[PDB]
Amino acid sequence: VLQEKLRKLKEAMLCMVCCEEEINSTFCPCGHTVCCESCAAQLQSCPVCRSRVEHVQHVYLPTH
Amino acid sequence: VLQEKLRKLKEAMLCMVCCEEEINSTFCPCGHTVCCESCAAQLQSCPVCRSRVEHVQHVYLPTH
Numbered sequence A, B: 001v002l003q004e005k006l007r008k009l010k011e012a013m014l015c016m017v018c019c020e021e022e023i024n025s026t027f028c029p030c031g032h033t034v035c036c037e038s039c040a041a042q043l044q045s046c047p048v049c050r051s052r053v054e055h056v057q058h059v060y061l062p063t064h
Ligand SMILES: [Zn+2]
Pocket: A015, A016, A017, A018, A019, A020, A021, A035, A036, A037, A038, A039, A040
């Protein structure tokens, strides 16, 4: 079955902190798209690379 | 069937212009993430919404 395939991909599309909303925000300049809009707001650094978040950019991946 | 799914999804991960390379960069402040590095460097305005690209941010997606 591929039901687990989509399950693995969709699970990759979820916020890496609150783990509830989908990824839709980028941390500039490091460019790590790993949070949702409301978790990106609180964080002052990248939870992945630890680089100072200068600005946040709301992305629009058409993976929906 | 689940072929259409994967297909559609993986197709949503392809550059919108060259259609060859994968989507890996976004437009600013635009937001639309629909091109690959090589196509983003060539464009002066967003293909989707038609707004002058002020800056291109490299994306780093948890799927690529
Ligand atoms: Zn979140």
